[PDB]
Design a protein around this ligand. Structure first.
Ligand SMILES: [Zn+2]
Ligand SMILES: [Zn+2]
Length: 60
């Protein structure tokens, strides 16, 4: 089977300043903690929950 690809997120490191909820695990990302936020969509997550973020990335 040949190689097809899926749109991945473009994660940038952002410090949590507002109330945030991790998309994969549903839990809150606490103040001052590092979070991964997609440049293209609304997806935000814990650094450790990164691989479980819903695919493909659909820019918002
Ligand atoms: Zn995305
Ligand atoms: Zn999480």
């Amino acid at each position: 089977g040949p190689l097809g690809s899926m749109r991945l997120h473009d994660f940038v490191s952002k410090t949590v300043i507002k109330p945030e909820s991790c998309v994969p695990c549903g839990k809150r990302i606490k103040f001052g903690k590092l979070s991964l936020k997609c440049r293209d969509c609304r997806v935000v997550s814990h650094p450790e929950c990164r691989d479980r973020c819903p695919l493909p990335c659909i820019p918002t």
